[PDB]
Amino acid sequence: ATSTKKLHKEPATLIKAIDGDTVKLMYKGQPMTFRLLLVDTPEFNEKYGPEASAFTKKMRENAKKIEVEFDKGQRTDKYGRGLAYIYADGKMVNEALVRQGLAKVAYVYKGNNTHEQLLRKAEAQAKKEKLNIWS
Amino acid sequence: ATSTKKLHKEPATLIKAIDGDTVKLMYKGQPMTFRLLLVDTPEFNEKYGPEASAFTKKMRENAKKIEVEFDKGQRTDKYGRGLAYIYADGKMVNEALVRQGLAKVAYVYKGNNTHEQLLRKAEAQAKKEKLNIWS
Ligand SMILES: Cc1cn([C@H]2C[C@H](OP(=O)(O)O)[C@@H](COP(=O)(O)O)O2)c(=O)[nH]c1=O
Ligand SMILES: Cc1cn([C@H]2C[C@H](OP(=O)(O)O)[C@@H](COP(=O)(O)O)O2)c(=O)[nH]c1=O
Ligand SMILES: [Ca+2]
Ligand SMILES: [Ca+2]
């Protein structure tokens, strides 16, 4: 019967965004996952985890230019991720996350802490304003 | 010397978008790749390939709601991809691509051709307007 031939729409959603302190990029011919130096965003299932992922996706998606800046030490972590400061039209993602209270300054290792004080300043300002993680 | 401690920014880019006739979605708890029924976008290295990928990404990224609609036949192709019509706020991605001359109507198989004439109408209109593939 013609009445039984109609189709039906079902729900779907986007695939879960990766944690906000990580970003996938093509660097010198290589897709790779970068882990953002000196910061930690919460896990997906923790308060601010999805907001931090959304924030980094927004920064990456809107950027006319993305740049990677390695520090003086190791270029990868023990999980094989690239370790860098990531910039979106000249604005450092690692600093913005901290400035908005969506990441804490964390994972400070020798040789890879050039921007430590810069990020601590951003964190202090997020705390003073009681933003997100600091609210 | 303090002068040699400065870091340097290097180029990076987004990872290549997937072909415009495919979309990755979470469906009933499962991330999977859907191949859009009844259409074919060009390959990445063919004219309109990147424009078609960009178009589908734009539709998926802006949607408040995404829906999947299977046809009456096979739910997967021989590559293990889901076969469906994909809608973004009620607008069918498969039809839009064809309507803009970014995909041709193609891969018409028995049991999975419910929207064949709808898509042929969209294609005829893209051709009449000499859009993209038809220019
Ligand atoms: C940022 C950073 C993380 N890591 C490691 C420390 C943690 O692994 P261990 O717990 O095994 O020590 C992990 C946290 O990353 P995530 O916050 O992405 O989970 O990544 C580094 O080794 N170097 C770094 O610079
Ligand atoms: C759309 C569609 C494609 N396919 C197969 C046909 C082509 O594989 P064969 O060339 O091995 O026959 C391939 C084209 O997909 P792509 O355009 O994604 O490359 O996908 C189906 O089997 N069923 C379908 O409905
Ligand atoms: Ca983390
Ligand atoms: Ca194709």
Q: Are strands B39-40 and B104-105 parallel, antiparallel or unpaired?
A: antiparallel
Could you report how far apart the first and last alpha carbons of chain B are, in Å?
61
Domains in chain B (CATH in brackets) are 1-135 (2.40.50.90)
> A46: buried, middle or exposed (CB in 10 Å: 19+, 13-18, 0-12)?
exposed
Token readout for B93 is 């991605």
Give the integer Cα–Cα distance in Å for A57 and A50: 11
H or E stretch including B88? Answer: strand B82-88
State the CB neighbour count (10 A cutoff) for residue A59. 21
Ligand 2: does its nearest atom lie under 6 Å from the Cβ of B70?
A: no
Q: Are strands A82-88 and A30-36 parallel, antiparallel or unpaired?
A: parallel
CA distances from A114 to A7, A67, A71 (A): 58, 17, 7
CA distances from A87 to A55, A56, A61, A116, B99 (A): 14, 11, 12, 16, 37
Helix (H, G, I), strand (E, B) or coil at B21: coil
Of residues B51, B81, B116, B120, which has the active-site annotation?
B81
Q: Are strands B30-36 and B82-88 parallel, antiparallel or unpaired?
A: parallel
H or E stretch including B120? Answer: helix B116-128
- The experimental method, as deposited, was X-ray
Q: Is the separation of the CB atoms in A10 and B71 below 8 Å?
A: no
Nearest to B15 among A8, A26, A86 (CB): A26
Of residues A35, A95, A99, A123, which has the active-site annotation?
A35
DSSP letters along chain A, please? -GGG-----EEEBPPPPPPTTEEEEEETTEEEEEEETTEEPPPTTSTTHHHHHHHHHHHHHH-S-EEEE--SS-SB-TTS-EEEEEEETTEEHHHHHHHTTSSEE----TT--TTHHHHHHHHHHHHHTT-GGG-
> How many angstroms is the resolution?
1.9
Ligand 2: does its nearest atom lie under 6 Å from the Cβ of B40?
A: yes
Residue with the smallest CA separation from ligand 1 atom 12 is A78
Q: How far is the CA of B132 from the centre of ligand 1 (A)?
A: 47
Give the integer Cα–Cα distance in Å for A59 and A52: 11
Nearest alpha carbon to residue B49 among B58, B40, B62, B38: B40
Q: Is the separation of the CB atoms in A97 and A103 below 8 Å?
A: yes
